[PDB]
Each structure stands twice: as C-alpha cells, then as structure tokens.
C-alpha cells in the first residue's frame, strides 16, 4: 500500500525539517555536479591551447570543489541523522508512556515479543523514511533531469542513446515495486512471529529439555521463515543486479564510446563534443540507483508508521471517567464493590454481580474453587481492566477517578505469580518506595522472614537477581511480601501468597502480618482453609458470584458449598 | 567478516566457495580493463584518422559484456551462499540451545541468544552480496586499475599503486576510531530491548509499584542511555568520513600530478590525458564506495560475534550408553551426590545418599529453600552433580545418549510454563503421536476435563504467552495433564497443588496415585493432605536428609516430621 494517512499524522512534527532538507539536498547535489562541469570546460580547453595560467585555475577549482561537495554533503547526512535519532527517542518515549495506561488485555494479546518489536524495530524502521528518503528522491530528480537536459542541447543524437539504459531501468524498477508489495507486509507478520518464538524458546527451556516435542512448533515455524526469506530474496537480488548493470557508469561510458565512434568515423560529429558526455553522462546513475534501492525501506517505513499510529490512538484507562463525589458514607480505606460485572472476552462473563464490602480494620477471605474469579476481582480492583457494569469505590470515590498515582498509594498488592525485576536484592524489595534509606528494607525483609536468607547471597543486599537466577520459588515470593510491607498502604490485598511456604515459615509471615495490619483493610485470597479460620468474614465465590458469607462458624455449621469444601481436607 | 564468516559456511559448499572468489576477481579485472581501454580509444578518436578506433571498440565491448555476465553470475551465486549460511547457522543454533548448560543462560547470555535466533534475518541472506561483494570489489579495483595502467606508462602504474595503501589505512583508522562507541551503542541497544521485554512481561508489578511512567521507569533510564550512546556513535563516526575525504583528495592529487608531469615532459599526448581524467574519476569512485560499507561492516561484525558466542556455548555432558527397551519402572539412587549452583553460595547438597525402591511413591518434605526442587532437577537430569553420581536403574544417568536420558522422566514443574497455543496443543506437546484414548485418560486424571467442559471453546482456548490467559490453577492442571501424557517410567511431581482448591487437590491426588501405568513416583509437597499416599517420606533440611521412614511411623516418634504441621 502507498497510502500516507496515519503515516502523515504521526511524523507531522518533522513538518519543516523535510522541506528544508529537500532544498538543501537539491543544492548539495548541484555542488557534487560542479566539478564535472569544470572537468568538461578544462577538457575542451586543453585541446585548444589556453596557456598554463588558464589551466591552473580550472584544474585547482575542480579539485577543491570535489572536496567541498564531499564535505558539505556529509554535513547534511549528519544533521539528518541527528534530528532522527532525536525524533525516534521522542517517539518511543511517547509509546511506553501511552501503553503504560492501556488495559492489561492489550498486553496479554500481543505478548512480549510483539510489544518489544513495536517499540524497537518499528521506530527503527522509519530511519530511511525520515533521514535519507527526501534527499534521495530530490537528488534523483534534479541530477538526471538537467544532466540529460544539458546533454540534449550539445548533441541530441548521442544523448538519445543514453535513454536506452534509463528505459531498461524504469521497467526493472517498476516490475519490482509491483512484485514485492505483499511481501513487505508479509515480512512484518514473520518478524513479530519469530520474536514470540524466540521469547518462548529461551524462557521455557526447562520444559523443552524434558518433553522435547514442544520445540516442534518452533522448528516448524523456522523452516517456513527460512523458506519465506529464500523465495523473497532470490528473485529480488537478481532484479537489484539487473538494475545496477543498466545504471552503472561503465555502461554509459561504453554506450557513449560506441555511438560517438560511429559519428566521428563517418565525419558526422566532431570528437570535441564528446567531452561533455564522458564526464557528465555517468553521474546520474548513482542517484537513480539510490532512489531505486530505497523503495523497500520507504514502503516499510509506511507500515511501521501505520502500526505506530493505530496504537497511539487506542482507548486507554481514563482517570476521570465517572466519580459520584468524594464523600458521604464511606470512611477512608474502605473498599466497596456493588453490582460489578466483568468479562475478558466481550461475550463470556467471568464475574457476575458481586456486591461485597471491606471495612476499615477487618480481614476478609475470598475463598472458592479454582478458576472462579478471584484474581480477576483483585485485578479489576487494581484498575487493570475497567469493569463493565457497576462501580468500585475505595474510600468513597470511584477508582475510575483516582489518578492511578493516588490509587496505588491506597491499595497494596501481593500478586499470585511472584515476578521480580532484574536488579539487586534491595532494588526488588524497595520497588514501590525506591528510597527506603537502608534500614527500612532490612525491617521489611525481617518481617517477611527473608532477611537471614538475603544476607546469605554472594554479596548480600546487592546481589543482582533478575528472572529466577537465585532465590528458589518459595522465597522469591517472600521477597514480594516484603515489597508490600515496605511502603505501607491503608488497604492491602494479599493474593495466594503463602502457596510456596512451608507450615513453619508461613506461621511467622502470617503472624508478622497480623501485628502490622491491625488497622488496615485486608483481603487474603487463600486455598488453605486452615490459615483463615480466624478471619472476620469469609466469602465463597464460584462461577463468578458470591454464594456464602459469614464467620466460618456459621459457614461450616449452617449450609453448604463450604461445609463440603472444608470437610474435603478437614 | 573474514575468517569469521568463512567459519559459518559448511564444507559441502567449500567447492563453490573457492569458485566464487574467482568470478569476482575476473569481474573486477574485466571492469578495470574496460575502464583502461578508454585511453587508446580516445587517443585514436582524436587523431588523423578516427577510423582506427573501431578495433579499440570491439575490445571495450568485449570487456563490457564480460563484466555484465560475470556480475550477473556472481550476484546469482551470492544469494545461494546466503541461503546456505543462514539455513546452516539457524539450524545449528536451534539444535545447540537445548544442550547448553542451564547455568549458561545468565541475564546477558540470554539476550545474546534471543538476538541470535530473532534478529538474524534478511541480514544473513544479504551479506554475501550486499556487504562483501561490493567491499572486496571496491578494495580490489584501484590496484587492478593501476596494474592495467602500467602498460601505458609505468609512472602512472606506480603512482596509482600508491593510492591503495591510503584507502586501506583510511578504512582501518575509520573502523578504529568509532569501535568503542559502536560496541557501547550495541550494549545500550541490547539493554534497552531487554528492559522493554521485562516491562512488557512483568507489567502488573510495575504498575502496582507505580514504576511505569518514563520519569521513574527502569526502561526510561535504559532509553536515555541508549540515546546518549547512539549520539556518541554518530559523533565518533565522522572522523572516518573526513579521513576518507582526505585520502581521496590526496590520492587524486598524486595521480593528477603524475599525469600533468608526463603530459608536459612529452610522453602522453593531449588526447590521452583527457581520457586519463575519466580513468582517474573511475579510480576515485571506490574511495566513496567504501565509506558507505564501513558501518554495515561493523554491524555484521557484531551480528556474527553474537552468533558465534551462541554456537560456542558449553554443552551438557553426555556419554554414549542407551536403555534396555526404555527403563522398566526403575530404581532411582543417589551416590554421595553434591551440587552447588554456579553463581551463588556454597553447595546446596553435600554428600546426600539414598536409594529409592522401584514402583513406589516417595515424598520429599522440608522447610523452604532446603534443596528439594534441586533434588528433583538432579533426578530428572537437568543438572549435572559437581560430585557423586546419579544412578537410574543402575546405569549412571550421565553416561547415556543426550536423547536417551531425557526420556526417563516426566516432570511437573513448580512454576508451570505453557507455550503459546491452545490447550490440546500443550497437552499433546508431551506425546504428539498419541491417540484420543490416552489423551482423554491424561486429561481426565488431571481434572482438566471439567475445565474443558466449562470453557466456551475448551480444548482450543488460547493460553496466553505463558499461561496468562488462564488462572493459576488451570495452568497448573494443564501442566499436570501434559506431564501425565508421557510414557516415561518416572513421575517427578513438584509442588503441583499450590493453586488447586480443597476439592480439586483431593481429586487430583487420588487420580494421580491411582494411575494404571506403574511408575516410580516422587512427590515434593508443602501440604499434608497432598501426599497422603507416599509410603516413604524424606525430610530434607538445609541439604541433608534428617530422617526418613513411613508416614505411619514418622509421626509417632517425636521428630521434625511430627511437629512440622502441628503449628
Ligand atoms: N488474561 C485473560 N484473558 C482471558 N481470560 C482470562 C484471563 N485471565 C483469566 N482468565 C479467565 O478468567 C477466569 C477467572 O480466573 P481467575 O484468575 O479469577 O481465577 P482464580 O479464581 O483466581 O483461580 P486460583 O484461585 O485457582 O488461582 C479463569 O477461568 C480464566 O480462564
Ligand atoms: N537458579 C538458581 N541460581 C542460584 N541459586 C539458586 C537457584 N535456585 C535456587 N537456588 C538456591 O538453592 C537453594 C535450593 O533451592 P531449591 O529450589 O531446592 O528450594 P526449594 O526447596 O524448591 O524451595 P521451596 O520448597 O520453597 O520451593 C535455595 O536456597 C536457593 O537460594
Ligand atoms: Mg543511515
Ligand atoms: Mg488466582
Ligand atoms: Mg521449589
């Protein structure tokens, strides 16, 4: 596609440094074309005489102009690569500031290999289109058109032969932009498809070493990528070579030498009129070839610019959507669900009409079968998903009107999959509060019963952990329980947090969490029903709807759905 | 690019690789001869009779046609050497990766592998033409033009030989000025892509810790450093361009001085010097052709360095033994094993010895971080011990063929990782040539049949990147179903119940312990109702097996196991 819409709204702040680099690239190519109009006046001057005082100043004015035109041509392709390295950053800094507020459903559909591509290899695919696209298209129009105009007035007969290569070039370059135009979009579906395979082939390495047949889907999406590159570059490099053999300065120098030795041998021409050809009819080939070899990049920069603008127009999580008012009924740090309805796919719902409310200083349980909307409830409380019906009001105000920088300073979260960033052991505990001086990280680690272990790493609290390069899974979540103890919040939402903890090191972590949160609001999702026997309110939740709520001594002693989820395990 | 790229091409192509460097030398020789044949032509096209320039146009036409043919042939043989290096190296990397030691994949040895298997694309099928063909052609052209100028007069031959050391030195100094800034820009780009992948992967934690805005993101700093590195690279690249311009200018001055001197003294006529001017323009063109190819040269240097670093990784040890028709419900046994991790504290295990009976369930309980998921990884074979021996059915596991020792275990990992696809694809990833009877058996034992009958497009639902399109319990049950669908006569189950609720875990435990296929099962557990069946418990603590025995007698003698659950 040759459309520019959504590719002219994106790269619109470079409005002027493209009209100014078009008059500064059709003025530089007139300075790299000046030495050869002087080598032509000197060549027709040697033949006649012109005592050395005149040959000095046309020979020295053609070896200085070469240097000058080669110097003020690298001063423009350096000013262009600077205002592009400065624009790629200003653009890919708007990308990861825009998709830092898209709903998490936008992340779990692209993956991590199609998001890395979008940011790195899509703002890098606009190079050619930005820097060297207008100069190459404004030089290949003023050098050939004009070096072929000046040559039709010296001799139309010989200059009529130089259209031979120009006509063969125009067909080989027109049967190329036609032939390879589905394979410029078909090759962007393979880049973001091989990035995903590369991501899932290095991370899931312990699985490929046991089952083996899991690498089948990678080794079969690779013989196809190779088979697609093979029959994409095979017929393209031949047409990129037949396009250089016709545009080469050794072809014009033979055509001229062959058609001028026909007009001078038959006395039709004078050999002194060939001189304007030998030095000028060989220049415009470079410009023609440069604009021809740069249509693939020019068309890839229009797909990249269209993928980058359909993303910068997405619907994000607005921070004023609908508040009632900040007051009238609920104290600070009390959460309230009312008639909440949500579903990840438009058709199917996940949670259906849950009411529920958490009091300022009490503990709630949120128990229930697996796959029954509990992590989803916590997630849409964290404002990751923007529920579809009903409201959520933490502290009296809808969470759709909190700045997402005042929301996460009220609610704290210990997620169900303990993920930690690539930093030291103290840049993973002080992640919410990066500046806990040094003896608050130690107190947080002391409360989460991980201080003695972290003080055993190769170099203590300064050991770079990264993605599972230390800290066995049972104690890489006690480092995320400390990350939420440090940076205390008036309401803490604990997910399944003691899943990987033994029942001697979970009795201490859940005892140093009963002393801290004596006035906080807690919601502790749990599957071990014996840890939460002493909660203030247990709420069963199966198939996305509350079915039972009480104090567990009313639950196991009146009714079911809990007296047959607790009796299966005693 | 040379002696590095030559190492990538296979040997069956080392019969048409030394026949490709000949058709390029003949190509540049034809180009140089066609360029030089203009001086005898223009000298007879200006003379008394210009009709004796016909015998000098036949030769120019011959040279031009030969140049056309040779360039087309070397552009056709070029891509056939890219389609044979890309294929070879990609397949070699894909086959090498599942054998590299698990302690090789650090945080920086993983970005390298990911770039090797993800970035290397049209720049491996297009360096054999794009990079090396014009580069060697432009390097060779001035010297051959000088050797062809020698017959006209030797002064110009020795004046144009003096030009090629200038071009070589300009190339060397241009590549040596920017080299540090270039490798720094490469490191910055790699760090930026790694930070971007981390930001896209662990996004909920970053959001809940409000570290997502680029003012405080961990990726904003990487982007800033990447920008400064690229600006420094742009600034350091220009001395190379100025030096190339200076080399061009002074070589042109030497050639023009020799030509003017030889014209004045009386050797060359005036018709000849005019053709020599065109010859020297053609001579100067390679100088401006190499300036473009230098940066691409450094880029392909970096790419091939990455590929080679991946291809020269330390592989895991493996002997040559095999099995007797697989195993036959084997007996695992540790023989004074001791294993410490590569980067970390001292040894996890040190001299742990025990013998597991064949066809018996065995539990491994203990405190957190006390060496259990490392005992399972030593049994499986994912880690070689640093002292001692692991004997499955008597045969040391490290004296077995690499493909005959990954078929005696089916592991359920602590952190389940499913691949991108549907549910049935992941379940069939263990045994792809399975029927529907064994598939239904596996999926029913792991309580995934109700999960499938409870989903809109069950057995075809996408499962996200790892399991992100599934709950923590559904992903774990899919992993259990996958691990049960394999004929390995050893079932290493890890925690594998942490996420299942009270009535899913009881069903899964009963079904897993009521398997029709006889196996040697090993269970690691933190819950008490999760073993309930194992006839032998191993209470590992800090790396030592404090005590073992049956559950019916460990809780009647006051020890670690008795009071490990009362409180
Ligand atoms: N990113 C997603 N896209 C689509 N569907 C999802 C996504 N995440 C979860 N689901 C679906 O929503 C349902 C609710 O799952 P949820 O994560 O709430 O389970 P849960 O009750 O927390 O489970 P457990 O307690 O066992 O961890 C699940 O059946 C799951 O299939
Ligand atoms: N990838 C790794 N690199 C370096 N050290 C590690 C790595 N994984 C674990 N360790 C260390 O080795 C020791 C043994 O860890 P292991 O995985 O056996 O713990 P675990 O018994 O699985 O813990 P849990 O039972 O709580 O999951 C741990 O103390 C841990 O700190
Ligand atoms: Mg560039
Ligand atoms: Mg959950
Ligand atoms: Mg473990």
Author numbering:
A (entry chain A): 276 to 845
B (entry chain B): 1 to 567
Give sentences copied directly from the paper behind this entry.
This protein complex is vital for the replication and viability of Mtb in macrophages, which reside in the lung alveoli. Like other ABC transporters, IrtAB contains two transmembrane domains (TMDs) and two nucleotide-binding domains (NBDs), with a single TMD and a single NBD in each of IrtA and IrtB.
To trap IrtAB in its ATP-bound state, the catalytic glutamate residues (Glu771 in IrtA and Glu495 in IrtB) were replaced by glutamine (IrtAB (E-Q)). By contrast, the SID-truncated IrtAB (E-Q) (IrtABΔSID (E-Q)) incubated with 10 mmol/L ATP-Mg2+ was suitable for cryo-EM and could be resolved at 3.1 Å resolution. Addition of ATP-Mg2+ resulted in an overall conformation that is substantially different from that of the ATP-free form. At the cytoplasmic side, the two NBDs of IrtA and IrtB form a “head-to-tail” dimer, characteristic of ABC transporters. Two ATP molecules are bound at the dimer interface, each of which is stabilized by an interaction between a Walker A motif in one NBD (IrtA or IrtB) and an ABC signature motif in the other NBD (IrtB or IrtA). Two magnesium ions are also observed, which ligand between the β- and γ-phosphates of ATP, a serine in the Walker A motif and the Q-loop glutamine, near the ABC signature motif. The TMHs of IrtAB do not split into two wings when ATP binds. As a result, the TMHs pack closely together to form an occluded amphipathic cavity with an approximate volume of ~4,600 Å3 (~2,700 Å3 in IrtA and ~1,900 Å3 in IrtB), which spans the entire thickness of the membrane and extends to the intracellular part of IrtAB. The marked difference between these two structures in the occluded state is that an additional unknown metal ion is observed in the cavity of IrtAB. However, the precise identity of the metal ion needs to be identified with more studies.
